[PDB]
């Protein structure tokens, strides 16, 4: 009934709104983030439409002392981290210090990738496991023992992917298969903002997607490849044929560990050709580069010229479809299942005033938070969603805005 | 034997390089431009490989007295203008004042196209002639009588196009035809404002004593370029159409086409989409932020030439004269782009021919008015060998 939410961007705004819709679970919330004015505007926008009591504060979640002081002052039962993944460990340390629960949506990656202690563990991992993405669960899983000892719950990656995709996996394994062997996670965004080119997020993340090496997991080994070197096509329910490429994703790591006997796990994402050409163009004229220069570094000078940051929410027309195709065995017989959710952009902006990218992450975040606090998912330790009972989550998904679909004998990627 | 060179960008870098390779004609040269640092780096980079004595200076060729004081001080026999077209009139004035010769590569375009008295001249022209390009020869042709009286030579547009494309025309008229009727000029392949107006300015050509202006890039064609292949072409307006229509007797139609790769046309369309070509911290204009951004990675070839259709001994005849230059043999020789190379060499030849006596004629001239022969032998000699095709393939 008393919750502290850290961060106040797109995801947070959806998660906070859905939270105020279930005011009987959440009687009081505190919205703290780097720029307090964002917290205040959201409070303004929400106050009067909910019975939930909303307080706000400025907070630099990169400083644990500042985070601890806050928990100490507001006294919450849990902390929902909807800030950046850079703050994961700091917020987790404070939760342990003050004995409150932790929920987030993205795993940890250092903000400064030149930090000596971070490189040493990172480089060692690049040599041992085989994949070189800057983020992974190693740092957060390491809290397993201290959290279990403090009787604290740490629910990790509770958005859509990661998050729901793991809930889909657990659900599939509990009701449809005896053993899952192949998991292909397909993320499709078929929305049209109306502009020739525009970015939904921090424009440097877009650069990370198309340029970072892509990787997957196959029979106990990570497999890394040249960025965007694996292409495919799929006819997405309610959207259509879309070109999709294999990228690396957080959940592949937890899934490979938690789904017994699993043989291969891949994650693909859609990329329209105009978008792809628009961005090898921008990176060719070096407009995405970070090399500071004078006299302003460019990538964010571009951020200035591009369309309003978040004012694509009212403009965007289209749909997203994120799901998973499972191949496994039930009663000694091969079986394929596809579970997905189709989210419509304009329904998202009409309801909470955001795009579907924020919506599909925000809603699962609140549900993950609800189940932890209401007791359903309160277990000491650090957890990824596939390790918990999927049932109450799948119900909350139907109840709170993200109904799902299950298809037996679907169309395969290959 | 003594020359003042104004400007020190790409073209100038090539030109001076070529100039120093012929030190028996050019004993000492002076390299002066806005930023003296480049003049010095170029000077260090060359001297020791040449016996030509090299001096350098800072000069804002926009102020006429500063130019005159430099000419009076350095006492050169001629001035090669390889700065921007904005400095043409300023430099020609100094040349006339001090009695020295003049050579440039592009004709005049005012730097501030909003300046009142310029526009009055400009618009009057737009109404009479029919073409609206900001640049034209009228300004410089006006100097004809004064230069002739001072016994001075002003050679206009001595690059590839204009320039060599005009030498090709004079050559074709002298050796291959009795009369040229159709001239089609074909140019095949770091300033986005030049590229931007290149793809957006109205296109125009000349036909039967009249100019015809059309929608920008509304006219497309394709041609299989010798040594390069099939490429896409669009009709653009170009300087030499004006001089040729005046100087090629009986010519009936003159057109200019330029190639535009699909890869380039989209890059251009992408940049215009994210608003990087716009013109408007809250004190910046986009297109100039873009210039701040940008040798061996570049691979390819250029092919610039002209297709003439005419009459010789009462029979229609077609001729194709062109030059093929490859980017790296020129970057391996003088360290530059093929665009600067194909303009740099013509810039020197005209200068050499003007002051060694070959082309010294009092007055203002475009290249088609002079004997093309010494210029082409020179083109073969200094790096830009040409080709002649009888019965080549047409356009249309
Ligand atoms: N499938 C999934 O599950 C996905 C999950 N996500 C996750 O959700 C988060 C995205 O939120 P997103 O909508 O892009 O959020 P935004 O980038 O708009 O989030 C902005 C909020 O983070 C706050 N913040 C950042 N740094 C700090 C700090 N040091 N201290 C306190 N607050 C801070 C910001 O402060 P300020 O307002 O001043 O900038 C801001 O309010 C991501 O970290 C990402 O990992 C994203 C995509 C997919
Ligand atoms: N085929 C052809 O016939 C072609 C012709 N051209 C011609 O070549 C010239 C192009 O030179 P380009 O290679 O593009 O040159 P650049 O754009 O690199 O020329 C730069 C030089 O111009 C000098 N400059 C500019 N303004 C002044 C001034 N007011 N006073 C003194 N110096 C000045 C610059 O000084 P600084 O470096 O300090 O700015 C610099 O050295 C043009 O005039 C154009 O007409 C262009 C393309 C091909």
Separation of CA B375 from chain center:
15
* A42 CB near ligand 1 (under 6 Å): no
Burial class (CB in 10 A: 0-12, 13-18, 19+), B287: middle
Q: Which residue of B has its CA nearest to A286?
A: B293
List strands edge to edge, sheet with B28-33.
B53-58, B28-33, B2-6, B78-81, B101-104, B153-156, B363-366
Distances (CA, A) of B294 to A381, B190, B305, B371: 53, 6, 28, 40
C-beta neighbour count of B304 within 10 angstroms: 27
Distances (CA, A) of A357 to A33, B107, B377: 20, 55, 68
Q: CB–CB of B312/B177 below 8 Å? A: yes
Task: Establish if A380 touches chain B: CB-CB under 8 angstroms.
Answer: no
Q: Which structure tokens are listed for A201? A: 């997020």
Say which residues have a Cβ less than 8 Å from residue A119's Cβ, sequence separation at least 6.
A113
Q: Where are the alpha helices (DSSP H) in B21-152?
A: 36-46, 64-74, 88-98, 116-128, 138-141, 144-149
In whole angstroms, give the CA distance from residue A363 to residue A413: 28
Of the candidates A394, A405, A345, which has an alpha carbon nearest to the alpha carbon of residue A163? A394
Of the candidates A97, A125, A100, A99, which has an alpha carbon nearest to the alpha carbon of residue A108? A125
Of the candidates A394, A275, A288, A363, which has an alpha carbon nearest to the alpha carbon of residue A10? A363
Considering the domain architecture, whether residues B100 and B214 belong to the same structural domain is answered as: no
C-beta neighbour count of A247 within 10 angstroms: 25
Helix (H) or strand (E) holding A67: helix A64-74
**Radius of gyration of chain A from its Cα atoms, rounded to whole angstroms:** 21
Instruction: Give this entry's resolution in angstroms.
Output: 2.8
- Report phi then psi at A6, rounded to 5: -105, 120
In whole angstroms, give the CA distance from residue B237 to residue B217: 10
Structural domain boundaries enclosing A188:
161-353
* A56 CB near ligand 1 (under 6 Å): no
C-beta neighbour count of A115 within 10 angstroms: 11
List strands edge to edge, sheet with A381-384.
A53-58, A28-33, A2-6, A78-81, A101-104, A153-156, A381-384
Measure A206 CA to nearest chain B CA, in Å. 15
In whole angstroms, give the CA distance from residue B121 to residue A95: 77
Measure A314 CA to nearest chain B CA, in Å. 20
What is the number of structural domains in chain B? 2
Say which residues have a Cβ less than 8 Å from residue B292's Cβ, sequence separation at least 6.
A293
Ligand nearest to the CA of A4: 1
In whole angstroms, give the CA distance from residue A146 to residue A58: 29
Q: Which residue of B has its CA nearest to A300?
A: B281
Q: Where are the alpha helices (DSSP H) in A133-213?
A: 138-141, 144-149, 164-175, 203-211
Q: Which structure tokens are listed for B341? A: 């190379």
Burial class (CB in 10 A: 0-12, 13-18, 19+), A20: buried
Burial class (CB in 10 A: 0-12, 13-18, 19+), A285: middle
Distances (CA, A) of A322 to A48, A350, B84, B278, B304: 33, 21, 56, 38, 54
Bridge partners, residue A226, by sequence: none
Considering the domain architecture, whether residues A107 and A170 belong to the same structural domain is answered as: no
Per-residue DSSP letter, A193: -
Mutate to test the interface with B, among A194, A275, A287, A297 (most CBs of B within 10 A): A287
* Most informative mutation of A4, A8, A9, A209 for ligand 1 (most atoms within 8 A of CB): A9
Of the candidates B192, B212, B194, which has an alpha carbon nearest to the alpha carbon of residue B203? B212
**Radius of gyration of chain B from its Cα atoms, rounded to whole angstroms:** 21
In whole angstroms, give the CA distance from residue B191 to residue A146: 61
Of the candidates A337, A212, A324, A185, which has an alpha carbon nearest to the alpha carbon of residue A267? A185
Handedness of CA A254, A260, A266, A270 (dihedral sign): negative
Q: CB–CB of B182/B310 below 8 Å? A: yes
Measure B50 CA to nearest chain A CA, in Å. 37
Of the candidates B242, B386, B396, which has an alpha carbon nearest to the alpha carbon of residue B303? B386
The terminus-to-terminus CA distance of chain B in angstroms comes to: 48
Q: CB–CB of B251/B180 below 8 Å? A: yes
Instruction: Find tokens 């596939």 and name the residue.
Output: A386
Q: CB–CB of B92/B102 below 8 Å? A: yes
Contact A281 B270 (CB under 8 A): yes
Considering the domain architecture, whether residues B179 and B321 belong to the same structural domain is answered as: yes
Bridge partners, residue A264, by sequence: A182, A218
Out of A353, A372, A387, a domain closes at A353
Q: Tell me the CATH number at B347.
A: 3.40.50.720
DSSP string for B213-276: EE-TT--EEEEEETTTEEEEEEE---THHHHHHHHSTT--EEEEEEE--HHHHHHHHHHHHTTS
CA triple A51-A52-A54, angle to 5 deg? 130
C-beta neighbour count of B120 within 10 angstroms: 10
* A9 CB near ligand 1 (under 6 Å): yes
Ligand nearest to the CA of B6: 2
Helix (H) or strand (E) holding A273: helix A273-284
Task: Establish if A296 touches chain B: CB-CB under 8 angstroms.
Answer: yes
- Report phi then psi at B56, rounded to 5: -135, 155
Ligand nearest to the CA of A209: 1
Instruction: Find tokens 């590229």 and name the residue.
Output: B195
Considering the domain architecture, whether residues A262 and A358 belong to the same structural domain is answered as: no
Out of B318, B335, B352, a domain closes at B335
In whole angstroms, give the CA distance from residue A19 to residue A24: 10
Considering the domain architecture, whether residues A188 and A57 belong to the same structural domain is answered as: no
Considering the domain architecture, whether residues A291 and A340 belong to the same structural domain is answered as: yes
C-beta neighbour count of A52 within 10 angstroms: 21
C-beta neighbour count of B279 within 10 angstroms: 9
In whole angstroms, give the CA distance from residue B247 to residue B241: 10
Contact A285 B281 (CB under 8 A): no
Q: Tell me the CATH number at B223.
A: 3.30.360.10
Say which residues have a Cβ less than 8 Å from residue B349's Cβ, sequence separation at least 6.
B158, B375, B378, B379, B382
Bridge partners, residue B156, by sequence: B366
Q: CB–CB of B239/B300 below 8 Å? A: no
Distances (CA, A) of A330 to A127, A181, A259, B161: 37, 11, 15, 76
In whole angstroms, give the CA distance from residue B231 to residue B259: 6
Looking from the CA of A9 toward its CB, the CA atoms found within 13 Å total: 15
Residue in A196, A284, A285 closest to B273 by CB? A196
* Most informative mutation of B11, B13, B157, B186 for ligand 2 (most atoms within 8 A of CB): B11
In whole angstroms, give the CA distance from residue A381 to residue A383: 6
Q: Which residues in chain B have Cβ-Cβ distances shorter than 8 Å to A298? A: 289, 293
Q: Which structure tokens are listed for B237? A: 């307006």
Considering the domain architecture, whether residues A343 and A386 belong to the same structural domain is answered as: no
With DSSP H G I counted as helix, E B as strand and the rest as coil, what are the percentages for chain A, rounded to 5? 40, 25, 35
Atom of ligand 1 nearest to the CA of A39: 41
CA triple B170-B176-B180, angle to 5 deg? 60
Considering the domain architecture, whether residues A77 and A188 belong to the same structural domain is answered as: no
Q: Which structure tokens are listed for A379? A: 């277990």
Task: Establish if A305 touches chain B: CB-CB under 8 angstroms.
Answer: yes
Considering the domain architecture, whether residues B152 and B230 belong to the same structural domain is answered as: no
Total residues belonging to chain B: 396
Considering the domain architecture, whether residues A136 and A264 belong to the same structural domain is answered as: no
DSSP string for A202-223: -HHHHHHHHHSPEEEEETTEEE
Q: Which structure tokens are listed for B119? A: 């526009």
Considering the domain architecture, whether residues B272 and B327 belong to the same structural domain is answered as: yes
Contacts of A223-228 spanning 24+ positions with Cβ under 8 A:
A223/A130, A224/A130, A224/A131, A224/A132, A224/A248, A228/A271, A228/A276
Considering the domain architecture, whether residues B313 and B394 belong to the same structural domain is answered as: no
Measure A285 CA to nearest chain B CA, in Å. 7
**Reduced to 3 states, what is the DSSP secondary structure of residue A140?**
helix
Q: Which structure tokens are listed for A353? A: 């005033």
Distances (CA, A) of A38 to A44, A73, A313, A359, A361: 10, 21, 17, 18, 19
Contact A305 B274 (CB under 8 A): yes
Out of B287, B314, B335, a domain closes at B335
Looking from the CA of B272 toward its CB, the CA atoms found within 13 Å total: 13
In whole angstroms, give the CA distance from residue B62 to residue B91: 8
**Reduced to 3 states, what is the DSSP secondary structure of residue A372?**
helix
**Reduced to 3 states, what is the DSSP secondary structure of residue B289?**
helix
In whole angstroms, give the CA distance from residue A172 to residue A164: 12
DSSP string for B82-105: -S-GGGHHHHHHHHHHHT-EEEES
CA triple B32-B33-B37, angle to 5 deg? 90
Mutate to test the interface with B, among A195, A197, A281 (most CBs of B within 10 A): A281
């Amino acid at each position: 009934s008393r919750l502290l939410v850290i961060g106040c961007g797109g995801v947070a705004q959806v998660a906070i709104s859905k939270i105020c819709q279930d005011s009987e679970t959440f009687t009081e919330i505190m919205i703290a983030s780097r720029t307090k004015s964002k917290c205040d505007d959201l409070k303004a926008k929400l106050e009067g439409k909910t019975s939930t009591k909303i307080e706000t504060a400025a907070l630099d979640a990169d400083k644990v002392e500042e985070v601890i002081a806050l928990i100490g002052s507001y006294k919450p039962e849990a902390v929902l981290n909807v800030a950046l993944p850079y703050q994961d460990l700091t917020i987790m340390d404070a939760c342990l210090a003050t004995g409150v629960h932790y929920i987030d949506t993205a795993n940890y990656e250092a903000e400064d990738t030149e930090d000596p202690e971070w490189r040493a563990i990172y480089e060692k991992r690049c040599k041992e496991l085989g994949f070189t993405a800057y983020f992974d669960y190693s740092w957060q899983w390491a809290y397993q023992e201290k959290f279990k000892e403090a009787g604290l719950t740490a629910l990790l990656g509770s958005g859509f992917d990661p998050g729901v995709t793991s809930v889909f996996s657990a659900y599939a394994l509990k009701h449809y298969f005896d053993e899952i062997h192949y998991i292909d996670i397909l993320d499709c965004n078929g929305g049209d903002h109306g502009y020739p080119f525009a970015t939904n997020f921090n424009p440097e993340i877009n650069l990370r997607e198309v340029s970072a090496p892509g990787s997957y997991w196959e029979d106990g080994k990570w497999v890394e490849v040249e960025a965007m070197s694996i292409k495919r096509e799929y006819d997405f329910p309610q959207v259509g044929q879309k070109d999709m490429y294999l990228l690396h994703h957080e959940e592949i790591e937890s899934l490979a560990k938690n789904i017994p006997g699993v043989k291969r796990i891949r994650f693909f994402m859609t990329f329209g050709q105009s978008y792809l050409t628009h961005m090898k163009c921008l990176e060719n004229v070096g407009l995405l580069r970070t090399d500071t220069i004078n006299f302003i570094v460019p990538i964010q000078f571009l951020k200035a010229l591009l369309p309003d940051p978040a004012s694509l929410g009212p403009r965007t027309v289209g749909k997203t479809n994120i799901g998973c195709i499972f191949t496994g065995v039930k009663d000694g017989v091969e079986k394929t299942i596809y579970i997905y959710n189709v989210c419509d952009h304009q329904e998202c902006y009409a309801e909470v005033g955001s795009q579907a990218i924020s919506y599909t992450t925000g809603v699962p975040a609140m549900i993950g938070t609800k189940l932890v606090m209401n007791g359903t998912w309160k277990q000491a330790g650090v957890y990824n969603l596939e390790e918990l009972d999927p049932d109450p989550f799948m119900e909350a998904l139907n109840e709170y805005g993200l109904p799902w679909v299950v298809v037996e004998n679907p169309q395969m990627v290959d």
